[PDB]
Structure 1
Amino acid sequence: ENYLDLFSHKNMKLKERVLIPVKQYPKFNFVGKILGPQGNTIKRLQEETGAKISVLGKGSMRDKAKEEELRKGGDPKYAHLNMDLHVFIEVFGPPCEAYALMAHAMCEVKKFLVPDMM
């Protein structure tokens, strides 16, 4: 119901939208740093954590033109381009595995979004 059953055949899902903190770090280029050259960082990042991890929202493609054009076209896949710029973490698994994965991805992503942490 609201309960987790450990013996359920369904996986659980955890999803989180973490805001990229552009307000706190107005000039830091998060989107570049996270994606990496040709998207290698976020590829690696996904591979290391076992989570699906996406940069979404206004600024996510760093091509004000292309972004404008895709929104204007009305296509629902690009609907996210209107939202605040954010990292979207999605994991699935049995409860223990899912929380572990979310925790792993959450903590790796924190490292990117709080870039002057000690």
Structure 2
Amino acid sequence: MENYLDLFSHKNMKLKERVLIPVKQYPKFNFVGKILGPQGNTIKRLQEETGAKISVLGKGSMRDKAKEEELRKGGDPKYAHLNMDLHVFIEVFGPPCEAYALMAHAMCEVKKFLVPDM
């Protein structure tokens, strides 16, 4: 079962999703480039439009194979994600109505990038 939502709680609810970037289904498609965009402007606009925090994470997320190597090796925990499957991490917060709405908007926008031929 689950906890109950209390509409009168003073706390926001948080929703988080880690959506796998489907590199098996599209082995040569450059998702990282397409999602970040030049200078990361696509993903910036995406976050503004959707009202969600959205991040590309996992092996490949930095597009600089060497910088990733070095950052992983340095053992710093902020870069732990570099070992994970490449994926998009969506995070929203709000009262339930708003939180679901944001997550729905973000998830639908991200699906357009991750299923590029539909």
Task: State the TM-score, normalizing by the size of structure 2.
Answer: 0.98
Once the two structures are superposed, what CA deviation does each residue of 1:89-112 show, in whole Å capped at 9, x if it has no partner?
A: 000000000000000000000000
Match of 1:56 in 2: 57
Following superposition, which runs of at least 4 residues in structure 1 exceed 4 angstroms of deviation?
none
For 2:40 and 2:10, locate their aligned partners in 1 and report how far apart those are by CA, in whole Å: 34
Count of paired positions: 117
Q: Report the alpha carbon displacement of residue 4 of structure 1 after superposing the two structures with TM.
A: 0.3
For 1:83 and 1:51, locate their aligned partners in 2 and report how far apart those are by CA, in whole Å: 22
Q: CA RMSD in A?
A: 0.8
Once the two structures are superposed, what CA deviation does each residue of 1:37-80 show, in whole Å capped at 9, x if it has no partner?
A: 10100000000000000000000001110000000000000000
Q: Report the alpha carbon displacement of residue 3 of structure 1 after superposing the two structures with TM.
A: 0.4
For 2:75 and 2:28, locate their aligned partners in 1 and report how far apart those are by CA, in whole Å: 30
SS in 2 for 1:6: coil
Structure 2 runs not aligned, ≥5 long = none
1:24 aligns with 2:25: yes
Q: Report the alpha carbon displacement of residue 35 of structure 1 after superposing the two structures with TM.
A: 0.3
Match of 1:97 in 2: 98
For 1:31 and 1:113, locate their aligned partners in 2 and report how far apart those are by CA, in whole Å: 10
